[PDB]
Every structure is written in structure tokens, then in C-alpha cells.
Design brief:
The structure is cut from a larger assembly and holds two copies of chain A.
Chain A: H1 33-37
């Protein structure tokens, strides 16, 4: 900058934007009754 | 005016003087730097 003894005439300022996002996630599994009754292990569900 | 034995049948005037009023002025500028770095202090005075 150079302020002469006269003066009379600059700076500005800016801001930026940040954007996120929420994404859904999940899964599942299935089993039959016979799988539980006739299984070698009796704690398979656990 | 010569009035006889019998009477029977002048003016006056005024004048108007006009004056006027006018506007005058002047003004000057200076800067702080001029006063600041100047050899003489009472330059403002």
C-alpha cells in the first residue's frame, strides 16, 4: 500500500462454504427355523 | 400665488430609495502532513 499525503482512495474480504452429506448404510441376513433346530451348535444364534 | 378679494379654487411628492445586500466569502485547505513535517510550529496561527 502507499498512502500519499493526499489520500482518498481498497481491500475486500471473502468467505467460502463447506458442505457435507449423510449417507445411509446397512445390511441384513436370514435364517430358517430348521437351521437352528438341526444345527451341530446350540449357540449359533448368539 | 396672487389671491384676489374673493378666494375660490399645489402638490407633494416622495421618492423611493432601494438598496441591496450581497454575499461574499473564501476558504482554504491544508493537510496534516503539511503541518506535521513543517519547520515552523505556529504555521496554523
Amino acid at each position: 500500500p502507499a498512502l500519499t499525503e493526499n489520500g482518498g482512495r481498497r481491500v475486500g474480504f471473502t468467505r467460502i462454504q463447506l458442505i457435507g452429506s449423510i449417507k445411509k448404510f446397512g445390511f441384513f441376513y436370514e435364517w430358517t427355523q430348521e437351521a437352528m433346530d438341526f444345527d451341530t451348535d446350540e449357540e449359533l444364534d448368539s
